[PDB]
């Protein structure tokens, strides 16, 4: 809206970054990382000769992806949970 090309002008490197997508209901996308540079369309227009290596270009195996499986599963209550806490009260006497 201001007119600059970059969406985020300053990002910390931190612990790294990963190609990510969130598809809604009844939505179809094609997450082409760029295993084949010829298969990567519009890359000559944007990304090539600007210094952008296609992500996952030499990686011979297709990149293993991780999807947010919406199946409920029991996991231990974190000690850092900002809403619930679990106390390990000892046995003592007249109390288990």
């Amino acid at each position: 809206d201001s007119g600059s090309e970059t969406a985020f002008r300053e990002i910390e490197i931190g612990d790294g970054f990963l190609p990510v997508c969130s598809l809604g209901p009844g939505q179809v996308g094609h997450l082409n990382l760029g295993q084949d540079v010829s298969s990567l369309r519009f890359f000559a227009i944007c990304g090539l000769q600007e210094g952008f290596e296609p992500f996952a270009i030499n990686m011979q195996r297709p990149v293993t992806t991780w999807f947010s499986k919406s199946l409920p599963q029991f996991e231990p209550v974190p000690p850092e949970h900002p809403h619930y806490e679990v106390a390990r009260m000892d046995g003592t006497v007249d109390t288990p």
Partner: protein
């Protein structure tokens, strides 16, 4: 927020000390600055208590209320999203309708107190930012909880006079019955807490211990508890209402007072006034205590409608439950059915300025009637003059600027994020705009100090005033008002034709720019098809030819304002849906009055049944292209034909792009939908030829100095650079950029021999080359925006299929860039020309459509650097960097060429490097790429040029 009660009390005490007496100027200053800086860093959630205290007596609007008004104009300006946006302000919550009604009450109080208090300069200077801030903070779609409020008046709440007012006995039986029932229902509330009411006093009963049924329970204390409800019902009949029962009917009762049922809106308002009755009946006794101490105000002694959610609920919920309990038990009470449209803030607020607009017409009726008298000072409405133009005009300015998206929002075309308006609210803002046009009609000389304010606020009124609902299913009064305004404006332009050969100064500075903005606003909707018809279309019909006659005239008086006329006619050209420039196919055009009307109807409307006869002065678009092609071939000059460039080119470049969408080449949605003929032969060739013609006129008049119209010619050709034929590149863009390159190179040669010259000769020659470089930057800023649009249009094609013309252009613009980088005088003359003609905004406009950061030359270099970056090979990219470190060694370009001839022996290996491997793979598999570029001459030339571009670009960004 954890300890908000004590910050509330501390804010209250600081306000008490700030308005307290026995304080010097500095002593009160410290307290008031503490108040301001304190509220600056306090969440607006807990400030509503101070806002209640503040709205109690800020409407007094005196010196003691000066600084609180400043506090309000800081706070309400700060928390815009908290009060206005339906979604709450970031990291905080959303305002309550409670606090929103304090906002409304504060705005109305300041407005009416300003309308009563006589004009004081000191007061009005500060009161008006507060009004703008409150208007911005309060959202338009907000509706008050009760439109028909009590609106009564340390105010003393007057107790309801129904204690002594007689009560009819046809409805006095149930007053007693209901009061006794509420005592019984209090006992029922006791037993709902598992506390059975006991005949005697018992400690185990946590709630009211001693309670008996009315047969034995003492009548005196029955009346003690029951008198507030008895008085409440007696009030509810006494305040001009009828609580007479709908049906014939009139210690533990299960049904309590409930508020489930809805009932009428005015009856809800009466219930709200009944809550006001509760407040004042309880508040008389509390005010008796308050005046005994003479300190502050009890928190609930402040009006119930200003109280917060819980304390206002203590009366509101009681009123609703009592009235709806009546209605459920068959006891409907009737008091007027005001629509929610009029209940909305925005409708009532702009209607309020409509009523003060007729009051402003009253003071202009006392001003215009006496302006004929010389040296007149009779001002019976001096307060009206010093209120309207002083406060209300920038008030509607700011409000319309900050809520124009909702005025312009439409139930179908939803533009405002908050929402859209009602049809009535859409039409009378148009009527307000027309009545302000009448208010300024022939009054440019009058209120001259506020004349720029009038014209700017009417520009703000000239936008978001038409939601294409007044024209389509709108009140005929407002439709006739706007149609007569159009007819009067066209007759006004017809008066300027006689003048050019007080309306003259009312047009050259007020009516013409506002007409320009209005037509631009119509074009930005692009729904002028329904707006410009019948009277509107005939008025624009004659306006178009009349201003063409002004273009025909060649006196200096029309010369001085012809650019403004040109902007207006371009706007109406993009707002005219008749295809005025195609008279041959006006029957093909459906929007024409010829198509819509019968020949007899045209005759009685005064139309010659033909656009040709209607405009004998303006020919067809084919004739205009023949003219402009002949003029460009003959080398048109700005002194030779100023009218063509500033008048007729706006016609052509506003008609052809917009009417391509109506042209046959534009894809119709379907064959039956596109069954009406396109009524134009423009297609895309006419756009392409028009762009070529303006490029030719710019390069032909590039030599002559002055010609300031280059800037507005460029922004007028902004929509025409898009969708151009690719051959135009080598046909026009390459030759004129080559001419500019060679000219600029001669100027840099003059600068270099000027450095070689003596000192005083260097200074004088430096001034003359500053003049030459300023006109050079003028020509660059006239042409290179077109280059930017063209290169963003065709960058993808030139990158997918490499273009030799594009590479030649790369070398062209690149050596222009290196001239700019070497010449420091060039850079500062670019900045000088930019600050002279305000091109800093124009460069950003060109960049967004399709200083050093906003430098046009470096911008068009970074747009099209990928062209030369494809020109160079990935194996030669290593040579590129090496030549870059070498150029950072400040080596001469002949030297860079010879050492690169040496350096051909260590080109980076592509097969060894995994990155260079695929870069070489794509570069070689590029369809237009050949191995002929491996020749050493081509390698050294292309690597030298490209690496020079990168070097100079990095020196520009960070030396």
């Amino acid at each position: 927020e954890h300890r908000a009660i004590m910050v509330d009390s501390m804010l209250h005490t600081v306000y008490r000390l700030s308005r307290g007496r026995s304080l010097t100027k500095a002593q009160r200053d410290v307290i008031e600055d503490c108040l301001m800086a304190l509220c600056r860093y306090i969440r607006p959630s807990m400030l509503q208590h101070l806002l209640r205290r503040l709205v109690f007596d800020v409407p007094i609007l005196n010196e003691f209320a000066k600084m609180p008004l400043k506090l309000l104009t800081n706070h309400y300006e700060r928390c815009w999203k908290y009060y206005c946006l339906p979604t709450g302000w970031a990291n905080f919550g959303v305002t309550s309708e409670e606090e929103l009604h304090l906002t409304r009450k504060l705005f109305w109080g300041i407005f009416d107190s300003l309308a009563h208090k006589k004009y004081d300069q000191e007061l009005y200077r500060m009161a008006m930012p507060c009004l703008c801030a409150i208007a911005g903070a309060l959202p338009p779609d907000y509706v008050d909880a009760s439109y028909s409020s009590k609106a009564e008046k340390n105010f003393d709440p007057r107790p309801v006079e129904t204690l002594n007012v007689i009560i009819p006995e046809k409805l006095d039986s149930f007053i007693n019955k209901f009061a006794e029932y509420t005592h019984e229902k209090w006992a029922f509330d006791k037993i709902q807490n598992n506390w059975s009411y006991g005949e005697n006093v018992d400690e185990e009963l946590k709630t009211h211990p001693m309670l008996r049924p009315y047969k034995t329970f003492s009548e005196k204390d029955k009346e003690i508890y029951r008198w507030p409800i008895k008085e409440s019902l007696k009030a509810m009949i006494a305040w001009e209402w009828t609580i007479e029962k709908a049906r014939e009917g009139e210690y533990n009762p299960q049904p309590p007072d409930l508020s489930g049922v809805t009932l009428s809106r005015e009856l809800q308002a009466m219930a709200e006034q009944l809550a006001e009755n509760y407040h004042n009946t309880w508040g008389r006794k509390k005010k008796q205590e308050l005046e005994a101490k003479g300190g502050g105000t009890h928190p609930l002694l402040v009006p119930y409608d200003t109280l917060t959610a819980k304390e206002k609920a203590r009366d509101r919920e009681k009123a609703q439950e009592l009235l709806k309990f009546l209605q459920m038990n068959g006891y409907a009470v009737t008091r007027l059915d005001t629509s929610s449209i009029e209940k909305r803030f925005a409708f009532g607020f702009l209607q309020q300025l409509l009523r003060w607009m007729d009051i402003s017409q009253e003071f202009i009726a006392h001003l215009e009637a006496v302006v004929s008298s010389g040296r007149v000072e009779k001002s019976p409405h001096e307060q009206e003059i010093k209120f309207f133009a002083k406060i209300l005009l920038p008030l509607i300015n700011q409000y319309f600027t900050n809520h124009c998206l909702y005025f312009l929002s439409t139930p179908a075309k939803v533009l405002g994020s908050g929402g859209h308006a009602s049809n009535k609210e859409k039409e009378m803002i148009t009527s307000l705009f027309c009545k302000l046009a009448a208010l300024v009609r022939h009054r440019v000389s009058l209120f001259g100090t506020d004349a720029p304010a009038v014209v700017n606020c009417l520009h703000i009124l000239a936008r978001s005033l038409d939601a294409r609902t007044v024209m389509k299913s709108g009140p005929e009064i407002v439709k006739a008002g706007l149609r007569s305004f159009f007819e009067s404006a066209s007759e006004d332009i017809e008066k300027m034709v006689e003048n050019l050969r007080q309306n003259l100064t009312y047009t050259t500075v007020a009516l013409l720019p506002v007409l320009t903005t209005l037509f631009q606003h119509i074009a930005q909707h692009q729904f002028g098809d329904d707006v410009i018809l019948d009277d509107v279309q005939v008025s624009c019909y004659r306006t178009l030819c009349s201003i063409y006659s002004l273009g025909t005239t060649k006196n200096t008086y029309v010369e001085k304002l012809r650019p403004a006329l040109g902007e207006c006619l371009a706007r109406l050209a993009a707002a005219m849906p008749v295809a005025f420039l195609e008279p041959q196919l006006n029957e093909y055009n459906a929007c024409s009055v010829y198509t819509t009307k019968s020949p007899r109807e045209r005759a009685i409307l005064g139309l010659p049944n033909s656009v040709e006869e209607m405009c004998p002065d303006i020919p067809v678009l084919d004739r205009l292209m023949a003219d402009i092609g002949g003029l460009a071939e003959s080398g048109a000059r700005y002194t030779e034909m100023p009218h063509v460039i500033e008048i007729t080119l706006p016609m052509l470049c506003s008609y052809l792009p917009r009417w391509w969408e109506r042209g046959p080449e534009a894809p119709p949605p379907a064959l039956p939908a596109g069954a009406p003929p396109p009524c134009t032969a423009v297609t895309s060739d006419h756009l392409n030829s028009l762009l070529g013609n303006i490029l030719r006129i710019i390069v032909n008049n590039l030599g002559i100095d002055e010609a300031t119209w280059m800037k507005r010619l460029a922004v007028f050709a902004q929509p025409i650079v898009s969708r151009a034929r690719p051959e135009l590149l080598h046909s026009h863009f390459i030759p004129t950029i080559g001419r500019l390159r060679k000219r600029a190179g001669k100027v840099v040669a003059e600068e270099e021999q000027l450095r070689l010259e003596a000192k005083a000769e260097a200074e004088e020659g430096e001034l003359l080359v500053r003049d030459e470089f300023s006109v050079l930057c003028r020509d660059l800023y006239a042409l290179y925006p077109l280059l930017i649009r063209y290169v963003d249009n065709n960058r993808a094609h030139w990158l997918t299929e490499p273009n030799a013309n594009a590479e030649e252009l790369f070398r062209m613009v690149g050596e222009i860039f290196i001239y700019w980088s070497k010449s420091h005088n060039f850079k500062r003359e670019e900045q000088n020309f930019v600050v002279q003609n305000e091109i800093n905004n124009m460069s950003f406009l060109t960049a967004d459509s399709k200083s050093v950061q906003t430098s046009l030359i470096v911008a068009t270099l970074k747009k099209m650097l990928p062209i030369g970056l494809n020109m160079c090979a990935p194996t030669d990219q290593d040579l590129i960097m090496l030549a870059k470190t070498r150029y950072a060694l400040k080596d001469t370009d002949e030297e860079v060429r010879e050492f690169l001839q040496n350096n051909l022996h260590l080109q980076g290996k592509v097969e060894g490097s995994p990155s260079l491997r695929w870069q070489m793979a794509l570069y070689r598999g590029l369809p237009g790429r050949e191995e002929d570029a491996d020749d050493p001459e081509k390698i050294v030339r292309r690597v030298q040029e490209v690496s020079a571009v990168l070097y100079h670009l990095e020196q520009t960004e960070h030396p």
